[PDB]
Amino acid sequence: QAEVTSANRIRKNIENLSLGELESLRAAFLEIENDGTYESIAKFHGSPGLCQLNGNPISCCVHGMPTFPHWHRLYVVVVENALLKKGSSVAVPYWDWTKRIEHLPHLISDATYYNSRQHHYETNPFHHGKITHENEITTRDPKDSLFHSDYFYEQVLYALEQDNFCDFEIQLEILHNALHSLLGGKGKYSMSNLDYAAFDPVFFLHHATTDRIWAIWQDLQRFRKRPYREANCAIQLMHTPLQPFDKSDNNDEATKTHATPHDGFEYQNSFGYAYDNLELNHYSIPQLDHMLQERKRHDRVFAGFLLHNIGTSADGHVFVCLPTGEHTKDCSHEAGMFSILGGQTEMSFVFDRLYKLDITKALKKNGVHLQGDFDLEIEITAVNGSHLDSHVIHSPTILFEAGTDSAHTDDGHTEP
Amino acid sequence: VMIRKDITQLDKRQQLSLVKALESMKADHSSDGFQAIASFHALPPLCPSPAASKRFACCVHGMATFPQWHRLYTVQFQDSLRKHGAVVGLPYWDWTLPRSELPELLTVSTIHDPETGRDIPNPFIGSKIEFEGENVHTKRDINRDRLFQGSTKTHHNWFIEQALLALEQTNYCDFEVQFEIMHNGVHTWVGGKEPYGIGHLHYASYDPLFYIHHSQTDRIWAIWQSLQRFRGLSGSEANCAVNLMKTPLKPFSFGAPYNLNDHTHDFSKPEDTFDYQKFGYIYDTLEFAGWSIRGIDHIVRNRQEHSRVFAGFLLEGFGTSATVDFQVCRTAGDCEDAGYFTVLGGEKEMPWAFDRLYKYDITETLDKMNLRHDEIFQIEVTITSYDGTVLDSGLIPTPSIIYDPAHHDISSHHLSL
Amino acid sequence: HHSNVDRIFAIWQRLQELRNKDPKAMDCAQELLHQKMEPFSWEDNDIPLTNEHSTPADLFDYCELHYDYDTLNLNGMTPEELKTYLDERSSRARAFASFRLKGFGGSANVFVYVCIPDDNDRNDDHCEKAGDFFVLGGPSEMKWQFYRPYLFDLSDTVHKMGMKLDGHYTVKAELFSVNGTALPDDLLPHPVVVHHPEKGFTDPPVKHHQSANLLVRKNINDLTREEVLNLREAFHKFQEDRSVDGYQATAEYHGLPARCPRPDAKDRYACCVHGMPIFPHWHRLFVTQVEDALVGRGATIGIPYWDWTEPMTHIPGLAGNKTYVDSHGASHTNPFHSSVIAFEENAPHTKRQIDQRLFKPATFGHHTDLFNQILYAFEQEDYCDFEVQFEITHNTIHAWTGGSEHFSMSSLHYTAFDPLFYFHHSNVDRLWAVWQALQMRRHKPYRAHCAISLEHMHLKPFAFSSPLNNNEKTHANAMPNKIYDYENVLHYTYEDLTFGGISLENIEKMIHENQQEDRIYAGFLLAGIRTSANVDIFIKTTDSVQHKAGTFAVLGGSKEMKWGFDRVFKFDITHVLKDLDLTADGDFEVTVDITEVDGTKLASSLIPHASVIREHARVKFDKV
Ligand code: CUO
Ligand code: CUO
Ligand code: CUO
């Protein structure tokens, strides 16, 4: 589907950027920070809550909704347009998180930018920003600089596998949150917080990649020959206008037209921004498709989580404990973990469907079969580190998924 | 091979046995006895323990395990009747067909079996709720006789439409949600307004109709298994809800003194439950409204061929049983009765919520409406209790509207036109 | 049934006779014994015999009842046989579990299981049943709770399990009602396992050897100006230290803010252990932490101890002096004098009100109230018995010093802030050490018989590695068991281990002397419920003449975790009663006045009626 590729602008990986390209970016962001748009643009994501200009405020970003990728997609273009106004030569770059990174990107990391052409010493606008309303500086605390793993890939890959958009979104959103918690860490004002996260400049880069992945899914969809720009799920939501994009606060005309999420699908020509390459982990789209199939080959067992994400962001860890010790491994304690981004401001949201995580590898390792009786233990911790009552949260279910070839029964007789 | 047949088919002798057996069962002082058996399903609640402060009702309702639990429940009664000298397996009342007259076996108050020549009340007609003080006959107010108001074509019935859809799903879980809801309708229809009846979770096990209904429902479940075999999926094997299947179901798991029955006890794991043969009982026929199993599979594919629109309901879990009616209203404000479904429940009920959506086919209504998927229309729902009191909206989530275009019409012209 | 039990009871009397103890005599429960037993005493009943018999004292003589038992034997064992058999039992050391019995509600059955805390995997389910006991009780029964714990012999099960006494396990108990209603286990306290202590030349596994004495703790009075000067400077520097090792942070450990459960816990509770046998261990560790700080401060000497026991004319002045003009340098405030509460942002009333003049005249030199109380504690052979008495005496200083001021020593939360806190605890720690030394004279080692389970648990926040504790040493001896040998692990010493100038040997002989003297005690069950309070008790006669029996105080705060003494606290009634010339048996009302630190009156309902126990005289024992 042609709709995905752009003619007008190119979005490239941050590493790819030439010194010249970065230089425009450094300047543009710095100027945007100076300009009115930067602070106000940040507001759209979270605090201050713009959604109800008057009346009780709520965070604007749609989260926990299928509308979610559309909203953020619009958000990135908003900043991109701002950058262009700034005089940015290129589109916002994307920090491919999935790719394991030896170190954090130089562009973001640099505290100061020499910018030799004009002798000046300034902080890197990419490095951080300040939160005007709540007087503070954004902070980052990657607890885990560790991230070098298939884990991102698995999560995203799993998301890629789903044909259904809505099924896709739930998985997609979850992987999305990982960057936020991982970068923000403990820091109250950071990526880790729903309200604060918009402030950090990394936000733009991260969303750019997430948006790119969404685009990737889109192109894959056409490979499947499913309609690229068609969602037959959450129809009601799609038509809804996406604030604040709808309002006059948003100068950007394109976004306003774009407010309905339905229109959002075709980034190409709508947005007029393209990606240098649409591949995941250097896998061609047809390559991904083949890769997906292989995964399908084995039977899989998953744990499903009903996310009624409420409250501040929190991390959850879970593993399936087995009733016996002896020969059999004790609680592995590492089924996998997922995080949820949230804040008090956020509007309540509940996932329509379960969030599936693939337990299979761990279960096999422990040597349990699907049939084997096992319990799932979950621990939910706030970013704060306060324990959250698990009792309220519904227990996760265990699903077994197989391909067309299913097993025949021992007891009973299927064929007549 | 104990055989379960249509209640109508049953012989006078067959009937004779059931009437006597149940009546004797009623008398049975034993824990195996009827009054005791009834308590399994609902009040008095046995679940946490027979003697526990807080007790919950034994309903693995709203769960995948649900058909298995009820399947064991029926056999528990069946085995009991056999102890009584029941000649055959519990018969099934096929609601699917429209029925002008309610089944005579259950309906008649008095039974004058010719052999004895004596007249006694039909134990099948009702029972008394001993523990509940109400020493009343388990009352059924089938206020809605309307059940017999089937369609004119007569094949297509609400039950049939609902059931057929359930049959369509390959996934056991998906199948069960549709399957279970269809199950609920009979409970409400018979129980009606009456406080002690089929309508209430607590009381329903007391009425004898319960067994007949579940027998039919179990029959349809068996039908699904046979279809799955045709599909090639193993009938016994369940892919879904593996965790629940392993767990044993009480009170069946609680053997004596509460559960004399050995078979159910061993069988308490639902995994074991699928092969009904393990409980040696069979059904005279496995078919749905005259369609062969092969015919059913072929027909279902055809159903897909046309576009369909559905509304999905997430069932959060109600309080007491209630029935819901929903209608689609146009922007203009016209509104048409979309359709209805009901949920059985009581206070005692353990909490439960469905993992997935419950689809209902809106298509016919919308088509008349000449409304498209795109069209902006609102769906309004009203929930009413058994009493008829209106229940508030607000807690209730809105339904989604899904569009099912014809997808994979798997075909070649091999069917006769 | 009762005939048999009565028979068994008689048997016990018979065995006592074998003991050559007066079977009839019942020293304990004097209060109840005199009480007549209704309805028999009510005399609604026809039989006058019972009416006279109503006093339980009369009850012992079965013969008065004039009913006999054909034989008094238990399970075919002669009474001689029983006595000999029991002797053998005492031969072996055993492990027991102590259970408090609330004994409330209808009859209930309880089960206890010792499970092995180990559980690597798969929703572990492995455990064994220790044993059980039953209780009888109707819905309308007088509330009763066992004063004493009920021991059970775990040793059999432990061995059976294969778990040696030395093994890490936990125990849990379940209660089932006759009705079958489950009863909340949470209310019930955790039972403690006790192992038979071995008391001989070296109880702990470490080798205490003749100490070098690098850090010494001296009393404040001995401290010279130079010594005080370094201390003043060190404290000043210390309070300045913003670091976690810093003073403010150290203060938090004791009380508010309550870090203890975790820095992030739903229920934050005061970390300090009070009302527990663990209590001296935690405090001892606490003092070291400050002390380790002082050395960093550069303090020449360890924390000094303010021997409260000695009578004091007035405040030491080191603490008291508001401003310290060393004059060597420039005048400043005395860091000893006060501290500030950063979180509350209030100021501690370091200049606490000393409502009570501690300065007390002695019967003879050393004899003092605190001495008496403290000495009493020392007398007890049992660590746990000692702790109760010891802790209470400890409490008095806080109440006296703090006085009415909310922010002060008087408050559990606040107390840490006051610098006196360190001084007092140093002394208290000294007494604890003295007790151990005395035990040593007794040839009672460090090995503790009581609170085995408690000792194993590590004491936070000292345990917290990741949360704020700079000091590794404290972390090392988180466990209270390690705590006992202060010298080896802590490597701190005291200039002298004497109490009142009494040599350790001298004190031991001294204790014997008190033993010879007749003494009736009033026992108070102290489940210290709320904010700190002071309690004064006086005995009222029929004459309604009342004399003040004496006083004791308890420290507490809302934050404090709930605690209750297993055993009663004893005070010596004897002198007053003698003066009254009232007999122990005589009917005298006991009135208790509980005054809150606030000074608001507190209802007597808080305290249950104290029992009176009379201790008859024994012969003078051993002397060096
Ligand atoms: O989600 Cu709103 O931030 Cu990535
Ligand atoms: O299901 Cu529980 O009753 Cu028909
Ligand atoms: O005991 Cu904790 O305080 Cu002196």
Interval between CA A342 and ligand 1 midpoint (Å) = 9
- The residue type found at C548 is K
Residues 6+ apart with CB under 8 A from C32: C56
The rounded Cα A23 to chain-centroid distance in angstroms is 27
Where are any strands of DSSP class E within B77-199?
Answer: 110-111, 120-121
Task: Please give the residue of chain B at the shortest CA–CA distance from A401.
Answer: B239
Rounded Cα distance, C65 and C71, in Å = 17
Q: Look at strands B281-283 and B390-391 and give their pairing.
A: unpaired
* Residues lining ligand 3, Cβ inside 6 A: C 254, 272, 274, 283, 394, 398, 415, 425
- The residue type found at C378 is F
Rounded to 10 degrees, the C-alpha dihedral A155/A153/A146/A364 comes to 60
Burial class (CB in 10 A: 0-12, 13-18, 19+), B414: exposed
- The residue type found at B346 is G
Whether A127 has a binding-site annotation, put simply, is: no
C-alpha distance from residue C111 to each of A26, C100, C152, C171, C184 (Å):
71, 13, 12, 11, 13
Check CB contact under 8 Å for B51 and C180. yes
Rounded Cα distance, B259 and B262, in Å = 8
Chains A and B: how many Cβ contacts under 8 Å?
91
Q: Given the CA of residue B214, which atom of ligand 2 is nearest to it?
A: 4
Q: Are A189 and A139 in contact (CB under 8 A)?
A: yes
Helices C383-402, C279-297: axis angle to 10 degrees equals 60
B51 and C CB contact within 8 Å? yes
State residue A11 phi and psi, 5-degree precision.
-110, 130
Compute the nearest-CA separation of C453 from chain A (Å): 26
The rounded Cα C347 to chain-centroid distance in angstroms is 31
Beta bridge partner(s), residue B266: none
With CA atoms as reference, report the closest residue to C552 among C565, C562, C543: C565
Rounded Cα distance, C111 and C176, in Å = 8
Neighbours of C288 (CB within 10 A): 25
Task: Please give the residue of chain B at the shortest CA–CA distance from C183.
Answer: B53
Whether A387 has a binding-site annotation, put simply, is: no
- The residue type found at A157 is L
Residues 6+ apart with CB under 8 A from C558: C530, C531
The pick from C284, C555, C559 for probing ligand 3's pocket by mutation, whose C-beta has the most ligand atoms within 8 angstroms, reads C555
As annotated, the binding site of B includes 41, 61, 70, 183, 187, 214
Neighbours of C54 (CB within 10 A): 18
Compute the nearest-CA separation of B401 from chain A (Å): 7
Ligand number nearest to the C-alpha of C421: 3
Compute the nearest-CA separation of A341 from chain B (Å): 23
Interval between CA B70 and ligand 2 midpoint (Å) = 7
Neighbours of A67 (CB within 10 A): 21
In angstroms, how far apart are the furthest CA atoms of chain C? 92
User: What does the DSSP assignment read for B168-213?
Assistant: H--SHHHHHHHHHHHHHHHHHHHHTT-SSSTTSHHHHTTSTHHHHH
Give the mutation candidate from A188, A322, A381 for the C interface (greatest C CB count, under 10 A).
A322
Task: Please give the residue of chain A at the shortest CA–CA distance from C121.
Answer: A330
Whether C328 has a binding-site annotation, put simply, is: no
Residues 6+ apart with CB under 8 A from A28: A83, A84, A86, A87, A88
Ligand number nearest to the C-alpha of A206: 1
Check CB contact under 8 Å for C123 and A321. yes
Task: For ligand 2, atom 2, name the residue with the nearest CA.
Answer: B59
Beta bridge partner(s), residue C523: C570, C611
With CA atoms as reference, report the closest residue to C446 among C200, C210, C192: C200
C123 and A CB contact within 8 Å? yes
B243 and C CB contact within 8 Å? no
Cβ–ligand 1 distance for A197 under 6 Å, the answer yes
Please list every residue in chain C whose beta carbon sits closer than 8 Å to the beta carbon of residue A384.
Answer: 264
Resolution, given in Å to one decimal, reads 9.0
∠ CA(A404), CA(A406), CA(A407), 5° rounding? 165
Rounded Cα distance, B162 and A361, in Å = 39
Task: Please give the residue of chain C at the shortest CA–CA distance from B51.
Answer: C180
All chains having 3 or more CB pairs closer than 8 angstroms to chain C? A, B
Residues 6+ apart with CB under 8 A from B98: B147, B148, B149, B150, B151, B154, B157
Where are any strands of DSSP class E within A200-275?
Answer: 273-275
Task: For ligand 3, atom 2, name the residue with the nearest CA.
Answer: C272
The runs of H, that is alpha helices, within C183-322 are: 225-240, 247-254, 279-297
C263 and A CB contact within 8 Å? yes
Cβ–ligand 1 distance for A179 under 6 Å, the answer no
Give the mutation candidate from B46, B49, B53, B55 for the C interface (greatest C CB count, under 10 A).
B53
Please list every residue in chain A whose beta carbon sits closer than 8 Å to the beta carbon of residue B314.
Answer: 352
Contact residues, chain B to chain A, C-beta under 8 Å: 225-226, 228-230, 232-237, 239-243, 245-247, 271-272, 274-278, 293, 314, 353, 355-357, 373-374, 376, 400-403, 405
State residue C293 phi and psi, 5-degree precision.
-60, -50
A372 and C CB contact within 8 Å? no
Whether A148 has a binding-site annotation, put simply, is: no
Interval between CA C283 and ligand 3 midpoint (Å) = 7
Interval between CA A72 and ligand 1 midpoint (Å) = 7
